[PDB]
Design a protein around this ligand. Structure first.
Ligand code: EPA
Ligand code: EPA
Lengths: 271, 270
């Protein structure tokens, strides 16, 4: 409808504002180039990465790439630590969504388990750039070249994402739309082992209808509006599948590196 | 021909559906409970009014308030803007009535001139509620409480309209009834300066005749509806009289506020 479908798209927008510290616009700010309000320390190589591990600080001792842990793996650990944290915000974010907490715990776990990476890779575009990614809560900025200059096993696990972030930022969405887009991916009725599918499917529908109208009063000048955004959701589904594939293999050949137990829980039923 | 009269009535009903941007049906559906609700943006204070102007919006008239135009006057401005727009629709409505378009334009104008406000108040009831009314295609809803909190002048030209609307809605009329009713108040033979009254009187007769026959096959189980509507017309003729007197007062007293050129024309000899 209107107000009800207005106070719905807004409640999910505030939930999105108080659960995610870095917002697309708060981040599109830094990457800008005219506003020196925040000049992100660029990396691009081992040296600056080493100092950054001080000038940007990080709870893991000054760097640390011993014979048991190398550079590329350190980026990996860095990356999975962030992911584990984004999973936390996504959990709190969803718990704020209208009929989400209504579902039984097990069903909430099933939705997060299968949608947290899709939402993550979507938010990733908000802090990304054609030439790099914004890290360390806006304070830092690692170049895309550096990441491509990583070992053979890893490296090609972050590239495909940039490809996504690029195209996805062409649509020019803002945090208000993004909030509705994320709620929609988390509340997906196609997740395996879901118990009350009819319920989820129903909550998803209004999310999408809310998104639908919201794009009408926000982006009146294209056609991507919904179909293209619905196709991205499908694109994202594949990005994750491919992502999960690379994760298992890494775990199978990179015995050296450790995988966080939570990401292991998420990965073990995705084929 | 008692028959083939329900046809002339359906044509009038088509003229009503094609020309008015808001019908009672679409209106009564907005003020619904919750089942497939809509819930219009509410305006009940200066804040929400400001939020409306920016959100629900309208267009031009967003003039300040302390200077040569204030809050109450801003509502008055939006009031006459909705009034000038309803007049345009009423003109098209009438022109979609062959019998009406037969007459000479000068006569047509005299009819639109002395009947447009009466029709505007009958219809007002369709978008009105016991507590407020819809605005901007039903997108908004202004409370009755707010309106009555305006400066004494503007506030009391609004109240009487509600008193009328509430009692009018008790009759429970649908759009097809209103079409006949509104056509009746416009093709009225007693209008000042009417040139060919015998012609008008006759079209009025047919409309009221079709009106009574339509109320036959739409409101079977019902009291003295037909004549009850004839007294409403009389009541409408009086409400417009006191409205014109109140408009008179604002023209002499609220010199700072401006009136639309078309509306001054309707009140010139009125
Ligand atoms: C508040 C931060 C919000 C949104 C930004 C989203 C994501 C940043 C985190 C990771 C992105 C970097 C690389 C992605 C590629 C591989 C990581 C796999 C992580 C994992 O083990 O689950
Ligand atoms: C939207 C038009 C369709 C259906 C309803 C019909 C008419 C209601 C329109 C305007 C009435 C609103 C406020 C009237 C109160 C004061 C202004 C009187 C102005 C005047 O004398 O011409």
């Amino acid at each position: 409808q209107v107000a009800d479908l207005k106070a719905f798209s807004k409640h999910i927008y505030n939930a999105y504002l108080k659960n995610f510290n870095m917002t697309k616009k708060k981040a599109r700010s830094i990457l800008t180039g005219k506003a020196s309000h925040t000049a992100p320390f660029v990396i691009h190589d081992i040296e600056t990465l080493w100092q950054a591990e001080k000038g940007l600080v990080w709870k893991q001792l000054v760097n640390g790439l011993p014979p048991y842990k190398e550079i590329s793996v350190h980026v990996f650990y860095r990356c999975q630590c962030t992911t584990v944290e984004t999973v936390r915000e996504l959990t709190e974010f969803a718990k704020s969504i209208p009929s989400f907490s209504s579902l039984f715990l097990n069903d909430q776990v099933t939705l997060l388990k299968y949608g947290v990476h899709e939402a993550i890779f979507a938010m990733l575009a908000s802090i990304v750039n054609k030439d790099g990614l914004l890290v360390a809560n806006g304070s830092g900025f690692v170049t895309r070249e550096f990441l491509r200059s990583l070992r053979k096993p890893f490296s090609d696990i972050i590239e495909p994402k940039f490809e996504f972030a690029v195209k996805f930022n062409a649509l020019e969405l803002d945090d208000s739309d993004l909030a509705l887009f994320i709620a929609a991916i988390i509340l997906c009725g196609d997740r395996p082992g879901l118990m009350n599918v009819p319920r989820v499917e129903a909550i998803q529908d209004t999310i999408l209808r809310a998104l639908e109208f919201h794009l009408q009063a926000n982006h009146p000048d294209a056609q991507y509006l919904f179909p293209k955004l619905l196709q991205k959701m499908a694109d994202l589904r594949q990005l994750v599948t491919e992502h999960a594939q690379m994760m298992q293999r890494i775990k199978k050949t990179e015995t050296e590196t450790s995988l966080h137990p939570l990401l292991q829980e998420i990965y073990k039923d995705m084929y």
